Amino acid sequence: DKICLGHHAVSNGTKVNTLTERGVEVVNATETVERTNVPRICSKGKRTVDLGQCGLLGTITGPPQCDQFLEFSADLIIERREGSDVCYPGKFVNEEALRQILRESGGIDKETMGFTYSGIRTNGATSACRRSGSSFYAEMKWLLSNTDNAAFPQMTKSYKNTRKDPALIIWGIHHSGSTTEQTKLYGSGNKLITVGSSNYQQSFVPSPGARPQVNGQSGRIDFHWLMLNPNDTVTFSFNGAFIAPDRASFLRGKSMGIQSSVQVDANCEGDCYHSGGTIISNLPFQNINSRAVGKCPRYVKQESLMLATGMKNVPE
């Protein structure tokens, strides 16, 4: 007598939103926004360097905590909150730019500057940099007058980058905790440090004075840097207060740098990282961390956006 067409339905549908309507129930749906974080840095298959107590910029100068990171090689570089770039207190000018350079560097290779010295002391040390006794930045030399209060001779040192890639060059200006202390180390007078390449020019006059004690020291070191292009020459003309580079740094290739508070895990793979871990997902959006880096789902404000994968649910 008759035949009837129809469609399936279920008891428990899933709500989704449409152009015309909020909360329409459909037979099935699936999430588009990722909310599940893995609380580890998922580093399977990647050359990983976890800097721990070594600060990224310290890999260039070499305080004792960075002794094992002077020539590292990496796909993934992890910075930690406890990392410190210094032993003897100080900081870098254009510091964040340099961190960004080092984070994508692939790591660093070191080579001697070829600097030799006469007429001065070369082995300044301090209790702030401990290596079974007082020491100093591994990659630098604290240049001093031969004896207390002696005049530091006007000096010139030059280095030519004979390599195919640009050279990262670093130096330091030492600000003693007092004028008397400056004269004792480098002789009296207002010292001058000049630095120039073919695309860079700048000068520095120190400034002794009492700072609050950090790592037991009231002095500071200003660290400065520049990229020296292939075949370019850098010249250092200085009269004291100068922390000389012992070695130049070269970038190895490509890497990605992250900041995190969680442990490395070689049992999971992922390419989207943030401080709380790894977002592993094929979904196009995520609501976990707007500062996630790598190859990530897009950050959105919504916790959930359900995509219908079935018809409208019409139960009896």
Ligand X SMILES: CC(=O)N[C@H]1[C@H]([C@H](O)[C@H](O)CO)O[C@@](OC[C@H]2O[C@@H](O)[C@H](O)[C@@H](O)[C@H]2O)(C(=O)O)C[C@@H]1O
Comparison of 92 and 152: residue with beta carbon closer to other proteins = 92
Smallest gap from Cβ 5 to its own copies, in A, equals 23
Q: Select the binding partner of residue 207 from other proteins, ligand X, ligand NAG, none (C-beta < 5 to 8 A, by kind).
A: none
Q: Count the site residues for its own copies by CB under 8 A.
A: 31
**Six-digit token pair at 296?**
């990530």
- Please tell me the distance from the alpha carbon of residue 237 to that of residue 219, in angstroms, as a whole number: 22
Which of residues 30 and 179 has its CB atom nearest to ligand NAG in the complex? 30
Q: How many residues belong to the site for ligand NAG (CB under 6 A)?
A: 5
Q: How far is residue 83's CA from residue 103's CA, in Å, rounded to a whole number?
A: 14
Choose one: 2-10, 78-86, 120-128, 227-235; the region binding its own copies (CB under 8 A): 227-235
Contact status: 100 vs other proteins (CB under 8 A): yes
Q: CA nearest 169: which of 200, 147, 142, 146?
A: 200
Q: What are the CA-CA distances from residue 59 to residues 39, 130, 134, 160, 163 (Å)?
A: 27, 16, 19, 22, 21
Tell me if 93 contacts other proteins by CB under 8 A: no
* Residue 60 host element (H or E): helix 58-61
- Name the E strands within 100-154: 108-112, 120-121, 126-130, 134-135, 140-142, 144-145
Can you read off the two tokens belonging to residue 192?
């001058």
Could you say which residues in the range 211-240 bind ligand X, by CB under 6 A?
Answer: 216-217, 219
Amino acid at the residue 194: T
Region of 77-85, 142-150, 172-180, 231-239 interacting with other proteins (CB under 8 A): 77-85
By CB under 6 A, tell whether 153 contacts ligand X: no
* H or E element at residue 95: helix 95-103
Any contact of residue 158 with its own copies (CB under 8 A)?
Answer: yes
DSSP state of 120: E
Q: Identity (one letter) of the amino acid at 4? A: C
Minimum CB distance to its own copies, residue 199 (Å): 8
CB 157 within 8 A of CB 119: no
Look-up of token digits 């459909």: 26
* Part of the chain binding other proteins (CB under 8 A), chosen from 145-153, 156-164, 172-180, 298-306: 298-306
Of ligand NAG, its own copies, other proteins, none, which one sits near residue 291, judging by CB under 5 to 8 A according to partner kind?
other proteins
When the beta carbons of 67 and 82 are compared against its own copies, the nearer one is 82
Instruction: Give the interface with ligand NAG as residue ranges (CB under 6 A).
Output: 28, 30, 230-231, 309
Instruction: Give the interface with ligand X as residue ranges (CB under 6 A).
Output: 124-128, 134, 142, 144, 176-177, 181, 185, 216-217, 219
